[PDB]
RNA sequence: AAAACCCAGGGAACCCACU
């Protein structure tokens, strides 16, 4: 009856921005990254990578409600370093790491299949 | 430079009346020369302390040797030279009670300072000449370091 | 009774404030002129609360004494509870 | 239960000797003593299990039962005997007989 | 709020305490009026609190 | 009624194991031996056959209404 | 009539369903279903705002 | 900051499951890989069922549910198929769907088992997985029959559990809890893990404060819809694609802000 | 399909509606791939004293690992908790059925050891779609111009006498008038 | 209208249920040795409430017929099995003695409300409010009494892997968190 | 128009007993077909989600919408008028988790703190300095809760397991067990938060937060506690199991020894009564005296066994974790689960002789022993014998009968009370008059003070000695040095 | 025949559930 369909966990609608950047005003060099139609399966990794930057002072993520598919990543970096460039560096680092893991897994499969 | 107290203590008893918490235990320690008692809660897991150990304890208002009097925010990127590098165990907490053996007529001789480090308490019972730098509801550090 | 014999409590108690807010938001929603400079709002209840903090509600409240008499307190004359 | 006869006995404190019955006190100690006695008794049953209720509510119930001179029992026999209004008395359990 | 540090001697005149309390008791009004009947009611209303 | 297709917890394909499970049971095997002979290590997958009731055969005794 | 109709009576604009706990919303917030919200109406006055 | 270099060491590779170790990576990365195994790996599953006729004792929606949960061999077609909602076709086509047809009538006194073998596809590659016996869909008494045409479409685990290729994904790090993330009240009672390396005298490894989660152990057991290694490959590819799309959206948002 | 609000109950008086439904990846999991189907409140045990529920869970683990349908006759004296624990220990599990559960979101293993195992849950008739109903100026009774009774006839809720008393206590006279006159039978 | 129950008959300090009775009763449908044959054998008899006031009735033979510090040593009847004091709905409770009696009463009340295959020929019956389940299962943890209630042939409920864990906060007040994938699997 | 987010509704549960049984809430739209409400609202409603269904009313007019928003919002009735204490409190799962969270030995790595701070709505964005800087940056759980506590409030409470002799000797300000709750300047100094700190008890932390701060601030305080503690509970985790119900073999031997000693004690009392060697207590018959002795021995056995059982919890048993936090259960609950159920009672006494001088046909006639009369020596873990199981059913049936009959008789009561006083109000002259303007009280509650903004206080003038009263209050101005220490010298000479 | 079905005009008794 009120059961929502299956596809809103990942599908966006017209007028729905996938990512929304809101600059925080409480502390300098802080922004809120609102990711729509997503869950922990990206936010946890983004938080973990942003913890590896030694110039990031705050980086966390939360879901406002498990029934609403959206997450907010709050990123606070040191002054002279934008949080947005921290985010885009973390994304590139994850892409590089996953790609590297990919060819290494290919090599492992090849090593296993012919001994 | 910003140091409120400094003395060498010696561990005499570790949580003698029982072991209440697995990760933190209290140490009943006596001063080497100043003849004062100190009871300190310490994280055993990250800094194990055995009975009979001897350590230096330097209560300081700030880590920065210039006495810049930082507000107390977490700044891991500050590269200014702090005094924490000379030590190996920094506990940061607030002093909340300074009671002492005082009379309505004369001054107090034996003072007792109570400081809580988040949840870790420390009572320093000493003489008024050594605890004079402590102020109620003031901002301090711990800075201990064991030595042979 | 004149202002010399004005014996009720000077504080606007919670029932009076609750009814004043409702009856003022109802007026504002029905295209009544706004007493205070709004910074842009659509909900008339928020406008009424803003007027309450500004103490500019054009309402005089009639407090009925139990004997039959009544006092007339101005909203700006009443001390707001909050 | 018998006051006004036990209190007459020798070696018996006539000041602190209380009672459990409410009607008996009203015959002996009047109406205002009942308002105190009912307060203490009602407080006793409420606070017996360790629960707490503010004294404002205790005072009002004890006073509304004694604001008529006699014991106003909370039934149709006591509520519907005071001049409150036909609608008030018919709003209670007995409706047609009042109207 | 005011960072007393009660080890140091205080700096308020005790006569201010007595006068402040008496003035405060006048400001706490349950029953208005000035006739002695209202004065007794006001005294009895805040007898325990005063 | 009928055997579930997948483990509720796992999703392990169990619907094809029921006939072999019965064949092993009538083959004088203990049901515990039958379960790990069929290759069910997780007990959540084992309960799908250990606690299943095959009511479909009771449902098949009645003649079909529509023919 | 007095009790069953005058004192306590059936009222429009009311909903009744089972409650489920939820810790992700404030104490003054209640999570109502869409269908109840799509059947329960509030009379809003037309203003230029 | 930068990303560390992870490494893979495969302990075993079987047609059912794959067991391997990922070292020198964060805990969140490993957990995300597990979650993508469970959900984000796309496969082919039956989603559109048209019951032309039915006379079985099981009702129609029951048959459709049982058909949807049947695994399908999609080792290479799922990478070619477009999503049904994303295809520009006339609401169905072989480029975003796979046709299945079932037509079975029981014309004998024996109970005829409508198994997964009765599902006839038009694409020879996309077939039911079932050495092992076939998947029993429904039994039929004499005179009963069921005819249906089923379309299978690409989907992943978030959409529904019938698009879940993994039977079971075992995940554990630090089998001797040197990090002491969990605290055994009495560690003597606890049996050791498969990857534990302590002598039977010792219960748990000594605590180290400077340690971090690493050397993650995987055991990905496939349900048969995909090979256990292509599950991992497609999972990594999909996670990388999601990150790439997120970066593209981030770049659009940044250039809009500037 | 079971949705949230559907009333589920064990065989021990441990009833309860479905609070929420997470997917498999969000549900916690053991060292193996086993994720729980139902996650119940630990607080329902200590006051209700459904120790039989815990014993049923342990016996279910033992039965599923052993491969036999366990016996749970009340007065047996041949099957106690100690024997069940000893039997479970033989299958590579903890003595008392606790197991190291890993978090489904962060992946960090839970500090506590979650008691897990198979029980027998039963679904009750009291589902939420049969009980949910709302109304706005629906059908009106003919004897008096008041709303109907029961959701089958699109009836409205009754603002009974205690509700009127509570709204008097709140002092919300205007709301009480609205409910009893404007929203019921003007 | 009198209410009676069958009970074992105890001689001097011995049961009249000898081993030969069990041997003849195991081979039913062959010897045609039924319960009525045992009743006519003078081994068991029906005792009503009136006669219970004048009978010394033992729990079990293994305890109250062996010489000890004598309690009575004058038993007349012996209970066949203590578990038979329960009703039809209370007999499906695993380990009912380990629970609290209000919980057992609540389970017996809810046991009548659990949905499942209520009858085998439900497809013919035009019953109103018919609730049946897709995949009912026999309980892994069962009692010996279920073999006679035929609960293992028409069960109501599914064995489920439950975990008793405080969690995100939806299993808070007698509520349960379910698995979306499991539900999607029926 | 269809209701949207932010709309005001009235949300009540039958039976509506008190005025917190009917609250005003703000509408939030969520997909599924149930009323999702918050947790702390359960206690005023007494709705335990066990199939409970709720009623929701919508104020149609705009004027009545403001009437509810200014009167019936849940922040405005956190404190009850009936007992001047909060009614919202903290639900069990948050309470147990926060009790474990606020322990002294709780430490959090940067990431977990960095995650938890995101759920604080009232966070200014400044990460507090860790309690442990070296070797590793490590925050104490009390620091995180200090961020939760709003403004600057000061309270002193005692933990549930605070020893009564601790405040007597030393360590009264440095508690070895961390069992002294001290909140200072809006910061949690030290102590473990049980139900006596965050519950509905008067003078608790939430009650003081309501009074010192406003009411919206306390609303954020409740929401912040629930969100962050549940999120930390994911990392921590809380469960319950059979390992939480099994004591070591030494305790079981102690339990059996106590029962055997008590059982033999009753038997030797019984043989004293049979030989007329028992003497009757002055005030009752020899039967009632005999029943008193049997009840005393069994009650002592239940207490001693319960006390001995509750001394072997190993501080990790979840039963103790729930009872100590006071969230759910009691010391009796642990004792009956582990050690002994105890004596079963019907109508306040032992099991009556339903048959001819025997409770069951299984006991010999005139058997006044523990087992024969309803005492259960087994625990819920060991299981009850069939004679004990039936006797346990005896007690439970009495409980349900009480529950089923109490509703009708009690329910008639409040209707009489309300209808008797449905028109008693406070007029604008601060007097209390009924519908017919008859004054009931000259001032409400004889003082004119509402029942919400009052607190329990201690009168220092009462109960000193005469010399103690003079020593503590006279302000002796004759002493020089005392004046020098207390006042500044200009003020000292002014007084002198 | 605005066939604006702008969408019931039945009541009573009993039983069964849930709080
Ligand atoms: Mg309920
Ligand atoms: Zn499985
Ligand atoms: Zn297409």
Which CATH number characterizes residue A52's domain? Answer: 3.30.1360.10
Together in a domain, H129 and H200: no
d(CA B91, CA B87): 11
Does the annotation place F30 within a ligand binding site?
no
Does the annotation place H91 within a ligand binding site?
yes
Does the annotation place H87 within a ligand binding site?
yes
Angle between helices K92-101 and K216-236 (to 10 degrees): 70
Chain H residues lying within 8 Å of B24, measured CB to CB? none
Do I56 and K371 form a contact (C-beta atoms < 8 A)?
Answer: no
Q: How far is CA F34 from CA B71, C37, J152, in A?
A: 70, 82, 20
Chain I residues lying within 8 Å of F46, measured CB to CB? 64-65, 67
Do B126 and B99 form a contact (C-beta atoms < 8 A)?
Answer: no
CA of J107 to C1' of L15 (A): 22
d(CA C76, CA C55): 5
Does the annotation place F44 within a ligand binding site?
yes
Residue A83 neighbours by CB under 8 Å, 6+ apart? A29, A30, A31, A56, A75, A76, A77
Together in a domain, H250 and H147: no
Do K241 and K318 form a contact (C-beta atoms < 8 A)?
Answer: yes
How many domains is chain C built from? Answer: 1
Candidates A36, A37, A66, A109, partner chain H, best to mutate (most H CBs within 10 A): A109
d(CA H53, CA I108): 51
Candidates J137, J158, J163, partner chain F, best to mutate (most F CBs within 10 A): J137
Q: Which helix (H) or strand (E) covers residue A97, if one does?
A: helix A83-113
Resolution in A: 3.6
Phi (first) and psi of residue K373, to 5 degrees: -100, 5
CA of H129 to C1' of L15 (A): 54
d(CA H117, CA H129): 9
d(CA K134, CA B87): 9
Count CB atoms within 10 A of the CB of residue E47.
9
d(CA J43, CA J49): 19
d(CA J36, CA J43): 11
3-class secondary-structure state, position B27:
strand
The conformation of residue J91, written as its DSSP 8-state character, comes to: G
Q: Which domain holds residue A47?
A: 19-114
Give the distance from CA K146 to its chain's centroid: 23
Q: Which domain holds residue C58?
A: 1-82
Domain final position from H161, H192, H212? H161
d(CA J75, CA B89): 77
Give the distance from CA D94 to its chain's centroid: 22
Q: Which domain holds residue H58?
A: 43-161
Short-list H42, H33, H73, H74, CA closest to H170: H33
Q: Quote the longest CA-to-CA distance of chain G.
A: 45
- Window 63-92 of A, Cβ < 8 Å to B: 78
d(CA K338, CA H247): 58
Q: Which nucleotide is nearest to J106 (CA to C1')?
A: L18
d(CA G15, CA C23): 27
Count CB atoms within 10 A of the CB of residue K432.
23
Do H168 and I34 form a contact (C-beta atoms < 8 A)?
Answer: yes
Short-list H41, J91, I164, CA closest to K419: I164
Residue I186, min C-alpha distance to chain H (Å)? 48
- Helices then strands, each counted (H, E), chain K: 16, 16
Short-list G40, J161, B111, D31, CA closest to K55: G40
Q: Note if the bond before K135 is cis, omega within 30 degrees.
A: yes
Count CB atoms within 10 A of the CB of residue A46.
25
Give the distance from CA B100 to its chain's centroid: 17
CA of A2 to C1' of L6 (A): 27
d(CA K141, CA K139): 6
Residue H95 neighbours by CB under 8 Å, 6+ apart? H81, H82, H87, H89
- CB-based burial label for I89 (10 Å; 0-12, 13-18, 19+): middle
In a domain, A10, yes or no: no
J94: tokens are 């695993």
Nearest by CB to residue B119, choosing from K173, K177, K190, is K190
Phi (first) and psi of residue I37, to 5 degrees: -90, -45
Short-list H223, H183, J171, CA closest to G23: J171
Residue B32, min C-alpha distance to chain K (Å)? 23
Method used for this model?
A: cryo-EM
3-class secondary-structure state, position K477:
coil
Contact criterion met (CB < 8 Å) for J174 and K50 = yes
Together in a domain, H140 and H213: no
d(CA F30, CA I41): 36
Do J71 and J64 form a contact (C-beta atoms < 8 A)?
Answer: yes
For nucleotide L8, give the residue with the nearest CA to its C1': I139
How many domains is chain A built from? Answer: 1
In a domain, A82, yes or no: yes
Q: Which of J23, J37, J97, J174 is catalytic?
A: J174
The conformation of residue J83, written as its DSSP 8-state character, comes to: G
Chain J residues lying within 8 Å of K91, measured CB to CB? 172-173
- CB-based burial label for K136 (10 Å; 0-12, 13-18, 19+): middle
d(CA D31, CA D65): 10
Phi (first) and psi of residue B43, to 5 degrees: -75, 110
Chain C residues lying within 8 Å of I172, measured CB to CB? 18
d(CA H42, CA A60): 29
Tell me the DSSP string of I10-32.
Answer: -SSS-EEEEEEEE-TTTS-B-SS
G15: tokens are 């909903």
Together in a domain, H17 and H108: no
3-class secondary-structure state, position K346:
strand
Short-list H144, H145, H162, CA closest to H153: H162
Q: Is K363 left (phi over 0), alpha (psi -120 to 50) or beta?
A: beta
CA of I156 to C1' of L8 (A): 14
Which residues have CB atoms below 5 A from the ion given as ligand 2? F 7, 9-10, 12, 42, 44-45
Tell me the DSSP string of K245-265.
Answer: T---HHHHHHHHHHHHHHHHH
Range list of H helices, chain I: 44-48, 51-66, 81-89, 161-170, 173-177
Domain final position from H161, H184, H204? H161
Do H72 and H82 form a contact (C-beta atoms < 8 A)?
Answer: no
Residue H147 neighbours by CB under 8 Å, 6+ apart? H51, H52, H53, H54, H102, H103, H104
Residue D35, min C-alpha distance to chain G (Å)? 32
Nearest by CB to residue J172, choosing from K39, K380, K389, is K39
Contact criterion met (CB < 8 Å) for K63 and C22 = yes
Q: How far is CA B30 from CA B34, B120, B125, in A?
A: 9, 19, 10
d(CA H20, CA I66): 29
Contact criterion met (CB < 8 Å) for K126 and A67 = no
d(CA K471, CA K478): 13
Q: How far is CA J171 from CA C25, F65, G29, I58, K406, in A?
A: 41, 45, 19, 21, 30
Together in a domain, H137 and H242: no
* Strand I38-40 to J158-166 pairing: parallel
Closest ligand (CA of K49) = 1
Count CB atoms within 10 A of the CB of residue H173.
21
Residue J174 a catalytic site member: yes
Residue A19 neighbours by CB under 8 Å, 6+ apart? A33, A34, A35, A36, H246, H249, H250, H253
Short-list I14, I40, I6, I13, CA closest to I126: I6
In a domain, A94, yes or no: yes
The dihedral over CA atoms of K241, K242, K243, K249, expressed in degrees to the nearest 10, equals 160
Q: Which helix (H) or strand (E) covers residue B120, if one does?
A: strand B120-127
E48: tokens are 């325990």
- Residues whose CB falls within 7 A of nucleic chain L? I 15, 125-126, 139-143, 148, 153; J 109-110, 112-113; K 14-15, 48, 50-53
Half-sphere exposure in the Cβ direction for I58 (13 Å, CA):
29
3-class secondary-structure state, position H242:
helix
- Helices then strands, each counted (H, E), chain F: 4, 0
Domain final position from H113, H133, H161? H161
- CB-based burial label for I177 (10 Å; 0-12, 13-18, 19+): middle
How many domains is chain H built from? Answer: 2
d(CA I167, CA C35): 32
Give the distance from CA C4 to its chain's centroid: 22
Quick check: C13 contacting K, CB < 8 Å? no
């Amino acid at each position: 009856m009120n059961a929502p369909p299956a596809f809103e966990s990942f599908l966006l609608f017209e007028g729905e921005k996938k990512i929304t950047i809101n600059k925080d005003t409480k502390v300098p060099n802080a922004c809120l990254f609102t990711i729509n139609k997503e869950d922990h399966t990206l936010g946890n990794i983004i938080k973990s990578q942003l913890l590896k930057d030694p110039q990031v002072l705050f980086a966390g993520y939360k879901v406002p409600h498990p029934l609403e598919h959206k997450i907010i990543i709050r990123v606070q970096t040191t002054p002279d370093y934008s949080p947005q460039e921290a985010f885009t560096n973390a994304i590139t680092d994850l892409i590089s790491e996953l790609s590297l893991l990919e060819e290494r897994f290919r090599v492992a499969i090849k090593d296993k299949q012919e001994g | 430079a910003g140091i409120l107290f400094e003395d060498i203590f010696d561990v005499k008893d570790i949580d003698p009346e029982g072991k209440k918490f697995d990760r933190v235990s209290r140490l009943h320690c006596e001063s080497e020369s100043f003849k004062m008692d100190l009871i300190l809660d310490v994280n055993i897991q990250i800094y194990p302390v055995d009975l009979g150990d001897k350590f230096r304890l330097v209560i300081a208002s700030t880590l920065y040797e210039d006495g810049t009097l930082d507000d107390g925010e977490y700044n891991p990127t500050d590269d200014r030279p702090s005094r924490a590098d000379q030590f190996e165990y920094v506990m940061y907490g607030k002093v909340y009670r300074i009671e002492g053996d005082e009379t309505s007529t004369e001054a107090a001789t034996r003072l007792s300072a109570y400081v809580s480090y988040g949840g870790l308490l420390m009572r320093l019972q000493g003489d008024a000449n050594n605890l004079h730098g402590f102020e109620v509801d003031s901002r301090v550090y711990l800075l201990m370091k064991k030595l042979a | 009774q004149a202002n010399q014999k004005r014996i009720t409590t000077p504080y606007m108690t919670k029932y009076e404030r609750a009814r004043v807010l409702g009856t003022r938001a109802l007026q504002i929603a029905m295209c009544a002129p706004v007493m205070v400079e709004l910074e842009g709002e659509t909900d008339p209840l928020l406008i009424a609360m803003k007027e309450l903090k500004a103490r500019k509600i054009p309402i005089i409240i009639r407090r009925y004494l139990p004997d039959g008499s009544y006092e007339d307190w101005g909203v700006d004359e009443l001390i707001i509870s909050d | 239960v018998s006051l006004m006869r036990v209190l007459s006995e020798k070696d018996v404190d006539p000041v602190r000797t209380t009672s459990n019955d409410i009607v008996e006190i009203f015959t002996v100690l009047g109406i205002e003593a009942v308002r105190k006695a009912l307060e203490r008794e009602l407080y006793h049953v409420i606070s017996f299990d360790g629960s707490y209720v503010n004294y404002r509510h205790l005072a009002l119930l004890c006073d509304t039962m004694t604001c008529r001179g006699h014991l106003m029992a909370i039934t149709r026999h006591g509520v519907n005997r005071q001049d409150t209004g036909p609608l008030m008395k018919c709003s209670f359990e007995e409706t047609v007989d009042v109207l | 709020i005011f960072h007393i540090n009660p080890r140091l001697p205080s700096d308020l005149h005790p006569i201010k305490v007595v006068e402040g309390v008496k003035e405060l008791s006048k400001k706490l009004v349950i029953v208005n009026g000035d006739d002695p009947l209202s004065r007794q009611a006001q005294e009895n209303a805040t007898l325990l609190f005063n | 009624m009928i055997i579930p297709v997948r483990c509720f917890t796992c999703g392990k394909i169990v619907g094809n194991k029921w006939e072999a499970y019965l064949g092993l049971l009538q083959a004088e095997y203990t049901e515990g031996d039958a379960l790990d002979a069929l290759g069910l290590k997780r007990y959540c997958c084992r309960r799908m056959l250990l606690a299943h009731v095959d009511l479909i055969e009771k449902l098949l005794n009645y003649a079909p209404l529509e023919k | 009539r007095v009790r069953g109709n005058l004192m306590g009576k059936r009222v429009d604009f009311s909903a009744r369903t089972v409650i489920t706990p939820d810790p992700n919303l404030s104490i003054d917030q209640v999570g109502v279903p869409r269908s109840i919200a799509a059947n329960m109406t509030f009379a809003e006055i037309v203003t230029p705002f | 900051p930068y990303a560390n270099q992870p490494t893979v060491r495969i302990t075993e590779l079987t047609d059912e499951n794959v067991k391997f170790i990922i070292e020198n990576t964060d805990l969140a990365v490993a957990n995300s890989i597990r979650r993508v195994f469970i959900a984000e790996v796309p496969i082919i599953a039956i989603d559109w069922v048209q019951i032309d006729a039915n006379s079985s004792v099981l009702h129609d929606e029951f048959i459709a549910h049982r058909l949807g949960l049947i695994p399908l061999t999609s080792d290479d077609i799922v990478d070619k198929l477009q999503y049904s909602r994303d295809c520009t076709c006339e609401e169905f086509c072989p480029e975003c769907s796979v046709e299945f047809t079932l037509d079975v009538r029981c014309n004998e006194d024996q109970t005829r088992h409508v198994t997964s073998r009765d599902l006839i596809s038009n694409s020879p590659r996309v077939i039911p997985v079932t050495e092992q016996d076939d998947i029993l869909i429904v039994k039929l008494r004499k005179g009963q029959e069921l005819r249906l045409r089923a379309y299978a479409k690409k989907g992943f685990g978030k959409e529904h559990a019938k698009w879940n290729p993994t039977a079971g994904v075992a995940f554990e790090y630090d089998p001797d809890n040197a990090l002491r993330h969990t605290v055994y009240p009495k560690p003597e009672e606890w049996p050791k893990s498969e990857y534990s390396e302590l002598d039977e005298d010792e219960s748990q490894a000594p605590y180290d404060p400077n340690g971090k989660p690493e050397r993650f152990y995987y055991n990905v057991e496939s349900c048969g819809s995909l090979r256990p290694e292509t599950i991992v490959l497609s999972a990594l590819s999909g996670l990388k694609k999601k990150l790439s799309d997120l970066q593209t959206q981030l770049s659009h948002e940044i250039q809009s802000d500037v | 399909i079971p949705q949230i609000g559907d009333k589920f109950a064990s065989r021990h008086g441990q009833k309860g509606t479905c609070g929420i439904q997470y997917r498999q990846e969000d549900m916690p999991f053991t060292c193996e791939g086993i994720t729980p189907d139902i996650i119940i409140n630990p607080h329902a045990i200590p006051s209700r004293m459904t120790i039989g529920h815990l014993i049923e869970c342990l016996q279910g683990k033992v039965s599923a690992n052993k491969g036999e349908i366990g016996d749970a006759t009340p007065f047996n004296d041949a099957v106690n908790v100690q024997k069940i624990s000893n039997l479970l220990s033989d299958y590579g599990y903890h003595l008392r059925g606790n197991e190291v559960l890993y978090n489904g979101f962060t992946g960090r293993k839970i500090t506590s050891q979650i008691f897990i195992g198979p029980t027998y849950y039963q679904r009750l008739k009291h589902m939420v779609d049969d009980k949910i109903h709302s109304r706005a100026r629906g059908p009106i009774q003919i004897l008096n111009r008041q709303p109907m009774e029961g959701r089958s006839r699109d009836g409205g809720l009754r603002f009974g006498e205690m509700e009127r008393d509570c709204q008097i206590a709140h002092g919300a006279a205007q709301f009480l008038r609205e409910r009893l006159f404007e929203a019921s039978d003007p | 209208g009198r209410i009676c129950r069958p009970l074992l008959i105890v001689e001097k300090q011995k049961l009249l249920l000898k081993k030969r009775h069990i041997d003849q009763l195991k081979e039913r449908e062959y010897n045609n040795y039924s319960w009525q044959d045992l009743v006519a054998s003078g081994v068991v008899e029906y005792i009503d409430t009136l006669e219970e006031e004048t009978v010394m009735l033992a729990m079990t033979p293994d305890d109250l017929q062996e010489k000890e510090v004598a309690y009575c040593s004058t038993y007349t009847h012996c209970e066949i099995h203590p578990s038979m004091i329960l009703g039809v709905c209370a007999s499906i409770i695993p380990f009912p003695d380990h629970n609290q009696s209000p919980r057992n009463t609540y389970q017996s009340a809810m046991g009548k409300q659990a949905m499942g295959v209520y009858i085998t020929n439900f497809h013919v019956r035009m019953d109103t409010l018919a609730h049946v389940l897709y995949y009912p299962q026999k309980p892994l943890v069962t009692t010996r009494s279920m073999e006679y209630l035929r609960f293992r042939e028409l069960p109501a409920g599914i064995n489920s892997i439950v975990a008793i864990a405080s969690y995100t906060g939806y299993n808070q007040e007698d509520s349960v968190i379910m698995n979306r994938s499991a539900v999607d699997r029926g | 128009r269809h209701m949207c987010d932010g709309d005001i509704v009235i949300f009540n549960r039958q039976p509506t007993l008190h005025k917190m049984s009917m609250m005003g809430h703000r509408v939030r739209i969520l997909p599924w077909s149930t009323f999702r409400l918050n947790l702390s609202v359960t206690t005023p409603y007494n709705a335990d989600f066990d199939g409970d269904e709720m009623n929701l009313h919508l104020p149609q007019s705009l004027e009545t919408r403001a009437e509810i928003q200014e009167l019936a919002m849940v922040p405005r009735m956190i404190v009850t008028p009936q007992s001047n204490r909060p009614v919202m409190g903290i639900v069990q799962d948050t309470l147990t988790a926060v009790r474990k969270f606020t322990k002294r030995d709780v430490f959090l790595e940067r990431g977990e703190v960095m995650n938890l701070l995101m759920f604080l709505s009232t966070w200014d964005g400044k990460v507090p300095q860790p309690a442990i800087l070296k070797p590793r940056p490590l925050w104490t759980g009390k620091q995180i809760f200090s961020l939760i506590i709003p403004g600057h409030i000061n309270c002193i409470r005692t933990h549930s397991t605070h020893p009564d002799d601790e405040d007597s000797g030393p360590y009264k300000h440095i508690s070895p067990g961390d069992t002294k709750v001290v909140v200072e300047n809006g910061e949690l100094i030290m102590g473990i938060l049980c139900k006596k700190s965050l519950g509905t008890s008067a003078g608790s932390l939430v009650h003081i937060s309501y009074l010192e701060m406003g009411h919206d601030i306390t609303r954020l305080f409740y929401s912040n506690i629930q969100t962050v503690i549940n999120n930390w509970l994911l990392i921590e985790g809380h469960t319950i199991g059979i390992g939480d119900s099994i004591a070591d073999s030494k305790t079981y031997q102690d339990i059996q020894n106590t029962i055997k000693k008590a059982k033999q004690d009753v038997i030797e009392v019984i043989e004293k009564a049979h030989n007329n060697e028992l003497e009757p207590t002055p005030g009752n018959t020899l039967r009632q005296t005999f029943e008193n002795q049997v009840n005393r021995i069994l009650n002592d056995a239940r207490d001693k066994t319960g006390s001995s059982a509750q001394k072997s919890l190993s501080e990790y048993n979840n039963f103790k974790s729930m009872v100590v936090s006071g969230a759910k259960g009691s010391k009796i609950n642990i004792s009956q689960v582990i050690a002994v159920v105890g004596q079963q009672n019907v109508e306040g006494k032992r099991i009556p002789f339903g048959f001819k001088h025997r409770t069951l046909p299984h006991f010999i006639k005139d058997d006044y022993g523990p087992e024969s009369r309803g005492f259960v020596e087994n625990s819920y873990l060991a299981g009850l014998t069939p004679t004990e199981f039936f006797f346990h059913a005896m007690g439970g049936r009495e409980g349900l009968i009480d529950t089923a009959v109490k509703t009708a008789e009690t329910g008639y009561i409040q209707r009489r009370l309300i209808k008797s006083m449905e028109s008693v109000m406070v007029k604008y002259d601060a007097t209390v008059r009924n519908s017919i303007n008859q004054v009931v009280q000259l001032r409400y509650g004889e003082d004119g003070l509402a029942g919400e903004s009052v607190e329990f206080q201690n009168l220092a003038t009462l109960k000193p000695s005469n010399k103690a009263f003079e020593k503590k209050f006279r302000f002796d101005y004759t002493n020089e040095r005392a004046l020098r220490r207390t006042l500044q010298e200009d003020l000292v000479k002014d007084v002198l």
